[PDB]
Amino acid sequence: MNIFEMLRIDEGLRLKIYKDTEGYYTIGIGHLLTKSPSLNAAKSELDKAIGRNCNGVITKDEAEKLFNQDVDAAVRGILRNAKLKPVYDSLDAVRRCALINMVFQMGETGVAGFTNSLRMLQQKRWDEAAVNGAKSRWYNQTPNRAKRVITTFRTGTWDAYK
Ligand SMILES: [Cl-]
């Protein structure tokens, strides 16, 4: 199990523009295109990202390419973030994957808002952190996915995903 397989499980793979859980236009493996109500804007963003006239449809290869870019961006983003970096550095490999998952899903800013939970991860207080992170909008909106990530942080293993 690795980050890609993990996220592939949590986001799925769609080759046609779609609405994510909050109604935003997305494609591929959880690649957000735009937060605008317009499919036109979405289709525009899509072409800009792929570099071709897509007409809201991409190929597998294209979906995987966007995915490679997003994971890399997430990692670099974490490593640049003053708040996130220290947390990342203090963790074991599995739990680092869990932090990357959250960043991929909600952005650095969204994650940075788990101040309290993050501080607990840093102090290796596994159970407390899990309980705290569950008190969030994130958990209430996508509970099964949140549960999988939370268990990953609590246990440091891939169980939730196997
Ligand atoms: Cl709550």
Curated annotation (Swiss-Prot):
Keywords: Antimicrobial, Bacteriolytic enzyme, Cytolysis, Glycosidase, Host cell lysis by virus, Host cytoplasm, Hydrolase, Viral release from host cell. Changing residue 11 to Q: Complete loss of activity. GO terms for molecular function: lysozyme activity. Optimum pH is 7.3. PANTHER family: T4-TYPE LYSOZYME 1-RELATED. Belongs to the glycosyl hydrolase 24 family. This is Endolysin. It comes from Enterobacteria phage T4. The gene is E.
